[PDB]
Amino acid sequence: STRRLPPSIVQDTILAVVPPKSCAAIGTDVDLRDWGFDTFEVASRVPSVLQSVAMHVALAWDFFASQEEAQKWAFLVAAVENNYRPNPYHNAIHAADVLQGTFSLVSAAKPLMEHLTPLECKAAAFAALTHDVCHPGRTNAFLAAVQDPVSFKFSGKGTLEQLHTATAFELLNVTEFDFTSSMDNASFLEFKNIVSHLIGHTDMSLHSETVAKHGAKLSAGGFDCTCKEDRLEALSLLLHAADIGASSRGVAIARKWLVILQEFADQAEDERRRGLPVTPGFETPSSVEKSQIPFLDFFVIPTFDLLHQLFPSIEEPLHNLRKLRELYAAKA
Ligand SMILES: CCCc1nn(C)c2c(=O)[nH]c(-c3cc(S(=O)(=O)NC(=O)OC(C)C)ccc3OCC)nc12
Ligand SMILES: [Mg+2]
Numbered sequence: 001s002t003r004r005l006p007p008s009i010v011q012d013t014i015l016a017v018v019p020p021k022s023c024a025a026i027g028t029d030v031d032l033r034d035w036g037f038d039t040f041e042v043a044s045r046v047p048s049v050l051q052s053v054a055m056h057v058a059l060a061w062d063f064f065a066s067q068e069e070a071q072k073w074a075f076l077v078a079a080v081e082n083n084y085r086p087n088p089y090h091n092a093i094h095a096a097d098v099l100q101g102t103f104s105l106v107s108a109a110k111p112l113m114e115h116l117t118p119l120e121c122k123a124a125a126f127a128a129l130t131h132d133v134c135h136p137g138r139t140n141a142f143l144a145a146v147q148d149p150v151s152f153k154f155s156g157k158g159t160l161e162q163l164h165t166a167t168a169f170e171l172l173n174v175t176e177f178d179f180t181s182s183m184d185n186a187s188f189l190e191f192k193n194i195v196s197h198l199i200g201h202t203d204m205s206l207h208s209e210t211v212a213k214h215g216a217k218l219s220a221g222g223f224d225c226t227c228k229e230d231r232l233e234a235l236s237l238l239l240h241a242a243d244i245g246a247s248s249r250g251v252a253i254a255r256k257w258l259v260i261l262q263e264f265a266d267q268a269e270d271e272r273r274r275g276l277p278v279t280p281g282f283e284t285p286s287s288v289e290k291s292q293i294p295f296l297d298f299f300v301i302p303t304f305d306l307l308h309q310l311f312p313s314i315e316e317p318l319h320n321l322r323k324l325r326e327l328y329a330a331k332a
């Protein structure tokens, strides 16, 4: 607080209470569990796909004992959406997609579902919801490169992830948003640790490390769901898969999520205007489809291949990635 830095490009948390939007029915019960969910399409014709998804998840997983708790969750989600920037990719639509994705993967894994506690389900849902809150549409490396105050505040790996986590807790701390206020001090602590773990592990830098760790877990026999640390690890793997898994939901849906390149193009341009070195691979490439291939082979496919070995019933995402790769490979 003594060193002189430039103003941050990340916006401070907005604690203001904002009227929640109308939660239009966004599909069937089977539809919400379906990996084929098209988040952009829904956002297309409803007031808020994030708030509609959030409420359907809370109701499907029996989150509330009283209408009071339910109202706080509704106000919370509304305020979380009020804290997502209008980015091409890292926006409230991405958050909704990850929330529904997490909800979809978890409920597709019978054993994990048969063992998850109601508190772990709330924590997983809340984490998916807030995992990218206040994201500025610029990477952790860019924040460091421009010496953004948030890089100095949150030291070590995952600058943004740490910020998303703290922000989610500041919001949850607002009385009208605190749907967990009736929780015991011990339960709330378990809640925070779970949430902190889930969001922290969305940090892309941990990829090599996590794939290796989960591969070792697989060799030892996979997840023992009667063990809470194991359920935490499992949730962590599924949340992550959901976060980077839009391209596994189907060819047509994958096409809609190529907006990530728009954020890349923007950062590349931002860097040029600042006179900084341009991030490799961020400027628009000659062929979008073919540049996607090494990224799917390196990050996405391995993730869903491992996920399929740890939860043998979850096969759809991997087959879709393959169909997608084949299409990109054929492209001229
Ligand atoms: C930086 C070049 C790597 C890359 N190539 N391509 C095609 C993609 C791509 O399509 N997406 C990403 C990507 C990169 C990120 S990122 O966290 O902003 N950058 C990042 O951390 O990259 C890692 C390797 C350090 C986040 C999401 C991404 O995909 C959306 C799920 N990275 C790449
Ligand atoms: Mg993120």
Ligand SMILES: [Zn+2]
Pocket: 094, 098, 131, 132, 202, 243
């Ligand atoms: Zn994300």
